[PDB]
Amino acid sequence: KPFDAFISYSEHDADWTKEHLLKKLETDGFKICYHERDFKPGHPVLGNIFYCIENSHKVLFVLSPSFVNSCWCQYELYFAEHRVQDSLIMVVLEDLPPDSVPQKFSKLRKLLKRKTYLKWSPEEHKQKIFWHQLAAVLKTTN
Amino acid sequence: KPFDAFISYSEHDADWTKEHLLKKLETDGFKICYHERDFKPGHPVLGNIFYCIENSHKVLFVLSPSFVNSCWCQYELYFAEHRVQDSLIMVVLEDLPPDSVPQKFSKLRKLLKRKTYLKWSPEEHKQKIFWHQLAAVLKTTN
Ligand SMILES: *SC[C@H](NC(=O)CC[C@H](N)C(=O)O)C(=O)NCC(=O)O
Ligand SMILES: *SC[C@H](NC(=O)CC[C@H](N)C(=O)O)C(=O)NCC(=O)O
């Protein structure tokens, strides 16, 4: 695949995602797809939602209440769930209240219940581990 | 079902949809679901994308290039395609260039190729027929 990851995130989380997650990954040599930059309306290749996920090794979701509660983010979750499995990566930027994910997102719900995510932390020491573990998970097979 | 239709439309088409389609249908006694009014972030029942479609007899899409070319609208199309069949209703507000719908929306593509939509017209006479035919299709069985 030409991209290591397609990244999805809420508008609320855009500043953090662009300044920390995307900056770090791209500075570290990963090739990233994301719609805000790479979706081109009307373009026959780049102007549809299948392009990024079909051409990325992993799909990474930045999760927070703002993401889970958004109509548009829920549609994006639905799409990844139903299209995409080892290729899914969940980053918990802010804790999700219990049972706040709609019950019909049963795959995402099982992943969270099974503690298969990486959790952001404000502490330098934990953030250092976070970035190493995020690089590791991006390089796993599918 | 408590609602006759869940309605999806692009931001570009919002003014026309609210002032003509929604006004007419609601004045004419139809009960309509749509996220701009009826999606309530954080609400355990009303704050997820399954609520409207699970509780509406029909799903109606207002189609135009602005709809087909939008990332968010494509996600909404994907969801209806994969969740929802006789329950789907397509209203063509503005002509779609040939092959502009992404190829993986194969159900929507077959519906358009098979001429199963209602087309808006600026002419009073054709609009009169349009509204009668739209009421008729909303009342068909699934
Ligand atoms: S998770 C879906 C939305 N995210 C974004 O808007 C981030 C940028 C987009 N990916 C883009 O512009 O391409 C989101 O937060 N939903 C909007 C809302 O508040 O409902
Ligand atoms: S078709 C998806 C978007 N439609 C709307 O924004 C209409 C109102 C929403 N249903 C709502 O606020 O709940 C759309 O046009 N996408 C935004 C874009 O330009 O990409």
| CATH code where residue B131 lies | 3.40.50.10140
User: What is the length of chain B?
Assistant: 142
φ, ψ (nearest 5 deg) of residue B88: -90, 135
Separation of CA A49 and ligand 2 centre (Å): 15
CA–CA dist B125, B129 (Å, integer): 7
* CA-proximal residue: ligand 2, atom 14 (nearest): B10
Domain count, chain A: 1
Q: Return the CA Rg of chain A.
A: 14
Q: How many helices (H) and strands (E) does chain A have?
A: 8, 5
**Residue found under tokens 């939008």:** B70
Contact A111, A88 (CB under 8 A): yes
Token pair listed for A142 = 């599918």
Q: Is residue B77 within 8 Å of residue B108, measured between CB atoms?
A: yes
The resolution in angstroms reads: 1.8
- Distance (Å, rounded) from C-alpha B21 to C-alpha B137? 14
Residue of B11, B12, B49, B108 to test ligand 2 pocket, by largest number of atoms within 8 Å of CB? B11
The Cα B102–Cα A117 span in angstroms is: 32
For residue A139, what are its two tokens? Answer: 């390089």
Residue B94 CA to residue B66 CA, distance in Å, equals: 9
DSSP code at position B12: G
Give the separation between CA B79 and CA A101, rounded to whole angstroms.
Answer: 17
Q: Which domain holds residue A26?
A: 3-139
Neighbours of B6 (CB within 10 A): 26
